[PDB]
Design a protein around this ligand. Structure first.
Ligand SMILES: [Mg+2]
Ligand SMILES: [Mg+2]
Ligand SMILES: [Mg+2]
Ligand SMILES: [Mg+2]
Ligand SMILES: [Mg+2]
Ligand SMILES: [Mg+2]
Ligand SMILES: [Mg+2]
Ligand SMILES: [Mg+2]
Ligand SMILES: [Mg+2]
Length: 191
RNA sequence: UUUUGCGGUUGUCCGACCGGGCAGUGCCGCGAAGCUACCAUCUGCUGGAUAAUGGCUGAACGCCUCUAAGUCAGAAUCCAU
């Protein structure tokens, strides 16, 4: 079965502008500007009301229609990141060896870099470089916590995933050795 | 080891000495050059794409989900240097 029409709508709040050209979505607001190339999906964009973007697929199958809500959610995520931002909080956990974390912004590039030392008591220092536009800081509110903030949820979550994956225990009972850096809270910078 | 280079030495022959011949390299010691020995010495690189897996975002399926669109990492693998 091919559905004649599949429709979805995105409301755009008053403080931001959205431009779609050749399926390249650009969202600009108070916190900055984001871009996303959606040319790999056959979707029809339009303006259905004063501040509502309609996106539809015509004569699509189940596989094609499954991407409509994905595109909506992605563009909505871009909008909320542009307006309120995204903030991930990670917690260090360990049994015996305190995990040492040092974060600094590069001079020659705008990216932040995080070095992890004393993981499970081994001498190798593991260095992970954040995606551009993502800021990392040591939490001043409470101990053993990292704060990653940014405009793009994809970049923020990918940097957090990189930090989480770089700290793994090998050839051990993972049910017993729980040491690592794990994302604890996902939210927005504002409110 | 035919450098038949030097020395020693058996038998025989050149009358003796000296210096040599022959015994298909007489035999023995040392023996440079050349060849040669994990029997000696020197030297043997890092980029990309991935598989299994671990993930991000995220529908299908108002929830979920590494997957369906997209995407990160990743093997003595594969393709290059
Ligand atoms: Mg064991
Ligand atoms: Mg000889
Ligand atoms: Mg001689
Ligand atoms: Mg003689
Ligand atoms: Mg004769
Ligand atoms: Mg003989
Ligand atoms: Mg010799
Ligand atoms: Mg998810
Ligand atoms: Mg895919």
């Amino acid at each position: 079965m091919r559905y004649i029409h599949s429709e979805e709508t995105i409301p755009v709040p008053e403080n931001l502008k959205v431009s779609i050209k050749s399926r390249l979505v650009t969202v600009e607001g108070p916190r900055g500007k984001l871009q996303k190339d959606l040319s790999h999906i056959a979707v029809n964009f339009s303006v259905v009301k004063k501040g509502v973007i309609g996106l539809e697929i015509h004569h699509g199958s189940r596989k094609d229609v499954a991407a409509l809500r994905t595109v909506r959610t992605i563009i909505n995520n871009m909008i909320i990141g542009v307006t309120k931002g995204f903030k991930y909080k990670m917690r260090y956990v360990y049994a015996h060896f305190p995990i040492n974390v040092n974060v600094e912004k590069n001079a020659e590039t705008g990216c932040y870099e995080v070095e992890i030392r004393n993981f499970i008591g081994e001498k190798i220092v593991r260095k992970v470089v954040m995606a551009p536009g993502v800021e990392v800081e040591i939490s001043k509110a409470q101990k053993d916590e990292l704060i990653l903030s940014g405009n793009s949820l994809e970049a923020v979550s990918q940097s957090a995933a990189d930090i989480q994956q770089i700290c793994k225990v090998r050839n051990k009972d993972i049910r017993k050795f729980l040491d690592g850096i794990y994302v604890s809270e996902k939210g927005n910078i504002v409110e």
